[model samples]
Target chain A: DIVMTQSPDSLAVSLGERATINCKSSQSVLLSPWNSNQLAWYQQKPGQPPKLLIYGASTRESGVPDRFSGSGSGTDFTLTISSLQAEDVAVYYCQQYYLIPSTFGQGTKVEIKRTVAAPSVFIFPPSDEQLKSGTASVVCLLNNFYPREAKVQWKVDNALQSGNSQESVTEQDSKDSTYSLSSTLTLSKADYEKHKVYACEVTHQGLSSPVTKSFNRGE
Target chain B: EVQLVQSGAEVKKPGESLKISCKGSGYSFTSYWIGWVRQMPGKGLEWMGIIDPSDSDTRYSPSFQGQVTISADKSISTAYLQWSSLKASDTAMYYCARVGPADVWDSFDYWGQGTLVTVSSASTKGPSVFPLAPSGTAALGCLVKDYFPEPVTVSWNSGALTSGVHTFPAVLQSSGLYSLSSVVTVPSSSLGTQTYICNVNHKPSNTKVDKKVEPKS
Candidate 1:
């Protein structure tokens, strides 16, 4: 399936301010035969169906306001609302119609300056399969999070075993805009038996308390 | 430092079985996903399938599920796309790509040098173009003939006639080859300084062929 992922799951814009949403397709939706991008944009509000806002990637659909526009080509595209009025607040979705099994991006919500969304945190302990590889792999996944600058740290045996390991990887999911961090540490059978604990520490501006998760070595 | 190296080009008769390979090097191959892509000559890319080499978890597109096979060998860091019996239509360039370090598989990271596979009962021949000079107020036409396995792209030398160009689909002939014609109408303003050069892209055999027609005084 050709995936279409949108950025900024929620947007808060002042009235009359310009608001934009980004849509990234898994493949280039530009068809050579047509020499045109096969992308479309739409808007939906409660108690109503989605309204076609743009097509051909940039062409405004009939009945769409001049303030609504689309740009870019191929896989990366943007939909913008030049003047966000009270009535302009809604959820916007981008779709690729070039190939079958057509796909659409996760709708990005647009609202007035008084809107925002909270985030989530999760921790997965190291698996036996991973320990067999001579390293214990732990994952901390954050979902529906924005203002992406967040801090992630790992600890072993309650010590500051830090400095960003060479194998540690933190990635953002395209489909959900979720944040995920994976840190790996080499561990021997003897070390696993003697190690007291392993911990994941994260800091985000939205959280008042630290979202820390600790795992004990059979303690 | 992950690298995907695909097998060499292949030529096989129709109805024959074939399997091409992509071997990953310099990394833990089982940790990520590998996907296969198909590109027919003169056409766009088509996805076939993707496989997680770690668990042998494979997924195929409906268009390719029954048409081909995708498999991997975790111990060897190699993945393969195979066919039980090939068809002439199966002639295409196949590519393998590295994707996803975990469950999330969306875009490709690294790609292999595409492997060409030509499946036909007989070797394909180059197409010859016959320039049809404008009969005073009409468009210039090029009748492309004798190409086999169904693909030839036509372009003008100036590349000015990219739009407003009409190309007919290839039609099979009794001689077991194919023929198609393309017509182009250049703007009269530039026709005086421009020469009508029809270029047919029929690779490997017909690298370059040119036809020039000077505007009459």
Candidate 2:
């Protein structure tokens, strides 16, 4: 999900002279895990479809001359033609394959000029999620005995604790007519570390007494 | 601060009608353009279309012109992708995003966690099995590629053997087939003549399929 902005509308180069074009991608083309660039360079001859000349940034396609080089990493990239030939007078565009359809930079005519280059930062989302701080999880699972309607009460040191807890949908077992559900209580991990006692009280219609399950933060 | 949270995973019959939404947050919902993207189970992303919630202006890629519909509700800061008749092939991950500033052609700046749509049919073929590692360490590998409804159970040939069996979750192929792999850690290597059997339990059909694999020398 990025765009490509190639510099200079046109370029004027003498035969045998080098031509350098810079294309700044709004996002990193680096496939960091593989250490490969998803950026590419294309050549458009007058009215032909953009032809792939260099892919993975620097790897030239078959039949492409070594004179054409793609150099750089991440968002900032450059495509250089070592010796500009008359036949190579076609327009060049830089493309990024970070997404589909290939985000292409505006075509830069080889017969071009001197223009200011715009700077851009390379960005890619971090792959892994960070852990949440001070979060503790306590689960209460009631299994094998049910007439379906059941509620779980969370209590901390004899006080009824509400909120910050979710009860799972009760599931039925056909092998034997029974229901199973689990309720999770989340709170500050510090409270659990303090060796506090947490209790899960289950109230069911069939049971005259509320079944209570208690947990000590200690093992 | 832009955010787009799409609806959760969906499993539906091939002929069902459905509309999934992506709720936008933290930004001016009506000022930006939201686009939908399609990615098959094992493939790359394809831009389906874009919708400007500001005035309901919509554009569709030539590839997805008539296959799907894109709509939005400015009142709730949500966009939707719906279908009247779903096809088995329409099963894939769909993402919604906000197009970057200035122009609609600008790349997407913010995106929603994709919603997986699985269009299933009862005709999911045989849970075909094959051996992947002809011979390797003290491990024997078996692959199961033909099954549906995702959830499956695998059991090894023996009682004590189940302890070392590691059965991985099933993966969906573009063709709508689910493949699963299991590695069995045997007590010894190259027993060669002793065979190992895997029972792929198909809960949908209330049956199981077994494949016996012999460790090659």
Candidate 3:
């Protein structure tokens, strides 16, 4: 059974403001057990029943907006709406159908209201050894840290991961100027392979979704 | 892919109560509603009710009123069908259904396996008969030899039955039929004459308790 955890338990993204939802799996929802295309996302409104938004993690349900998109495969996934709509006040949930007795994330609610605007999106620089090898040791740095909290993880080869081997270490650099932190995993050989995909994911208190950037070793 | 496979076979007595359950796995419990149904010994089916595993919403059939209860645990996604008292007549097979939240009350698309129940009691025999008479009627002597195994049970409404309660024995004929007769005495000052009633209940549990009355001169 997989457990789902959603961040920003509650949020007030401005009308037209980009909103996002982050879903984390207890274990990598990756094919460790089943295929990927089996997962689906659902939206439940206050007084209405639940509706299917995205399935297979990114495929939109019939007649859904391009604005409503799902990205990410495996355990780490993001559901994002390019712009928030006043009518979009509801809780968003992610569930896995790869197995029976399917499980769902706690859920994140997106409401329309007044609130502070903060900078999001973390940048992880490729390490020297990364440039030397095919893998990159990217340091994900979060910006404009408010309420002081965040996470940085490695997306290896288009797959979201950090610890595949015992050498992988996720460290939180309070290596400080701003933003509070804690590390989850680190990749020692992040640049050992070609097209070796790598990305840093930033999750914050008020953000609707985590901000992520993909990196290429030689490019 | 989620699937629910249930169990089968159960036996109970005339007055005992019983409950059967169906557990669902391979799917979220709170996501679906479960329903129950009844199938007689060799008859068609009847709709009982449904329960939503999430909030435990329940609905019962009017004909099944006060007969059974349906309950569930959303976290587990399983449902139960229970009976208060198991009458010998209450023996039958029961099944469960997986219903949609919106259609929980309307229809049942998915069904659980099935369970059967049987009930029995003491000796159940064939027909019998009895005779009745009034006091001072000096055993009316006229041999009525033909009357034997009677219907099931007969009542003596009004007649010369000044005597206390009288029971009769019925005789079963060779043709598998039953015949019964009784003689009763009546008083001169009575407003009505004494009569006999014969009742009959057939096999497989049919209660045809009847009545036949004749007044004595």
- Residues A116-197, candidate 3, lDDT per residue (tens digit)? 3343343333334224544323333333344434556556676767444111111111222122221212343533544455
Runs in model 2 lying further than 4 Å from the true structure: A1-219, B123-136, B141-146, B151-179, B184-217
Worst 10 residues of 2 chain A by lDDT: A121-130
**Residue-by-residue lDDT tens digits, candidate 2, A1-219:** 576888876676766899999989887877756778877676755323345687777888778998999899988989899998767877787767665544557767775222222211011110111013444545454544445567788887787887766544422332333444545555555565655677878777667667776755443
lDDT of 1 by residue, B84-179 (tens): 999979988888877634232233546787888987675678876655444223355566656865568888765766753555556555456666
Q: Which CAPRI category fits model 3?
A: incorrect
Cα DockQ of the candidate 3 complex: 0.00
lDDT of 2 at B120: 80
DockQ of each: 0.01, 0.02, 0.00
All candidates' chain B TM-scores are 0.62, 0.69, 0.51
Q: Number of backbone collisions per candidate, in order?
A: 0, 5, 43
**Which candidate, 2 or 3, would have the higher TM-score against the true structure?**
2
Tens-digit lDDT track of model 1 for A46-85: 4333456887789886677899999999889999999998
